[PDB]
């Protein structure tokens, strides 16, 4: 009957809106997580690059000096 | 028109449910992916930190010992 379809429509709209809120929470969380991943990967890439730079600079320096000894 | 609206309504609910299932699979998959990313970044950060720690410890050790040589 008409009444059953109207109330059923009410259920449609309510559950739809609820799912929408769930989607907002989901994508928002994914966004924050991706920021954490980006900053972590970037920070550790930076630390690695600093390590390599230190090793290379100091090893070249030593090569120069003890090279000069002879 | 009553049965047309009932058929319409059933189709609405059906497409809604289908999209819902697709989304659940989507977010679940994204969660698993974030697990893998976290474990990989963590493992490689750990290996990097071990590398730096060992290099620093041994270089300090040699600095000390050959320092004693002088």
């Amino acid at each position: 009957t008409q009444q059953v379809l109207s109330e059923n429509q009410k259920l449609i709209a309510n559950k739809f809106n609820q799912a929408l809120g769930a989607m907002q929470t989901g994508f928002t969380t994914t966004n924050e997580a991706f920021r954490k991943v980006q900053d972590a990967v970037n920070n550790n890439a930076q630390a690695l690059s600093k390590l390599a730079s230190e090793l290379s600079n100091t090893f070249g320096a030593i090569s120069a000096s003890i090279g000069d000894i002879i | 028109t009553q049965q047309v609206l009932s058929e319409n309504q059933k189709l609405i609910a059906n497409k809604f449910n289908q999209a819902l299932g697709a989304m659940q699979t989507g977010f679940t998959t994204t969660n698993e992916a974030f697990r893998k990313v976290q474990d990989a970044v963590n493992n490689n950060a750990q290996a990097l930190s071990k590398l730096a720690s060992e290099l620093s410890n041994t270089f300090g050790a040699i600095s000390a010992s050959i320092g004693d040589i002088i």
């Binding site: 059923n8 989607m23 989901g26 969380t29 | 969660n31």
Partner: peptide, 30 residues
Amino acid sequence: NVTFLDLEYEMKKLEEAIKKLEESYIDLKE
């Protein structure tokens, strides 16, 4: 200068959102 990565809270947020989605299924009721 070396940092770790913790997404456990975010992953639980995703679990909860997926639960709301599971709780958003439209029953026929006719």
